[PDB]
Amino acid sequence: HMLHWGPKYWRSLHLYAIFFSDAPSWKEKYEAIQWILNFIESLPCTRCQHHAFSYLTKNPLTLNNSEDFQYWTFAFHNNVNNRLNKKIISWSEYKNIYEQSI
Amino acid sequence: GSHMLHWGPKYWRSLHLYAIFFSDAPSWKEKYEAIQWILNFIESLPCTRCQHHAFSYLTKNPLTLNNSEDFQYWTFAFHNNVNNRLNKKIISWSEYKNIYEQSILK
Ligand SMILES: Cc1cc2nc3c(=O)[nH]c(=O)nc-3n(C[C@H](O)[C@H](O)[C@H](O)COP(=O)(O)OP(=O)(O)OC[C@H]3O[C@@H](n4cnc5c(N)ncnc54)[C@H](O)[C@@H]3O)c2cc1C
Ligand SMILES: Cc1cc2nc3c(=O)[nH]c(=O)nc-3n(C[C@H](O)[C@H](O)[C@H](O)COP(=O)(O)OP(=O)(O)OC[C@H]3O[C@@H](n4cnc5c(N)ncnc54)[C@H](O)[C@@H]3O)c2cc1C
């Protein structure tokens, strides 16, 4: 199930951070954190939503600018990778993967 | 044991008073801080099951932070949702106002 949908929700998350302002106002930061909660609510997976929340409360969003936000999603994604014993990618590989979007 | 019959009231009081002292003309910054505070409030709950229910409720019921009364109602409704899940009494809005009247200096 999530084998198919996981990659799509991840792309939705990473692109969101990518299209986030580099000079955000508090209104944008507020809409960003609400978007994240909404993103978590969308995940069609019980265990995923539970882990996602524990991560979020323990690791506050970093929204001073776009790449700050990107980094945050990158670390979150790698934390899940680590838990599922998947490859933990480097920052340079992250940038290559999303180079066209960035 | 979680001993929620003792700790439960303490947490509800912290939640309702936070909404009560929230500004009537909050800035976007205060709204942002309110959301982080709610997330930290849920994390502090002394029971796993309590955290999951609260988390589930939050994502399905976005915080209403236009002003203090709106935030107060959000906490009030959330509190009644837990009352219902525990088959406890569902108090009325006016009863809520009587209960916290001495702090609602609006
Ligand atoms: C928020 C969220 C939480 C999830 N939680 C769980 C869970 O707890 N348990 C469970 O079984 N499944 C979970 N999933 C699913 C899981 O993370 C995968 O999406 C899935 O199992 C399919 O694996 P995958 O190999 O295609 O890679 P991903 O779906 O992990 O792969 C996405 C693709 O993104 C890239 N990528 C890899 N690492 C990163 C990174 N750090 N930053 C940016 N891009 C990266 C690569 O190009 C890769 O092919 C979750 C999905 C989301 C979106
Ligand atoms: C987020 C959260 C989740 C919880 N989840 C669980 C759980 O999953 N399982 C479990 O066993 N316990 C749980 N508890 C505990 C539980 O809600 C009670 O606190 C507890 O059972 C004690 O009940 P009580 O009768 O003293 O009244 P509480 O519900 O503790 O009462 C606080 C008091 O506030 C008033 N009040 C009642 N309803 C409302 C309202 N809607 N708005 C404002 N005030 C009201 C009355 O003065 C009342 O005596 C949770 C607590 C919190 C804070």
UniProtKB/Swiss-Prot annotation, chain B:
Gene3D superfamilies: ERV/ALR sulfhydryl oxidase domain. It catalyses: 2 R'C(R)SH + O2 = R'C(R)S-S(R)CR' + H2O2. Signal peptide: none annotated. It holds the Pfam family Evr1_Alr. GO terms for molecular function: flavin adenine dinucleotide binding; flavin-dependent sulfhydryl oxidase activity. The lineage of its organism: Viruses, Varidnaviria, Bamfordvirae, Nucleocytoviricota, Pokkesviricetes. It comes from African swine fever virus (strain Badajoz 1971 Vero-adapted). Its cofactor is FAD. Interacts with A151R. The keyword Cell membrane does not apply. InterPro entries: ALR/ERV (IPR039799), ERV/ALR_sulphydryl_oxid_sf (IPR036774), ERV/ALR_sulphydryl_oxidase (IPR017905). This is FAD-linked sulfhydryl oxidase. FAD-dependent sulfhydryl oxidase that catalyzes the formation of disulfide bonds in viral proteins produced in the cell cytoplasm. Involved in virion maturation. Belongs to the asfivirus B119L family. One of its GO terms (cellular component) is host cell cytoplasm. It is an enzyme of class 1 (oxidoreductase).
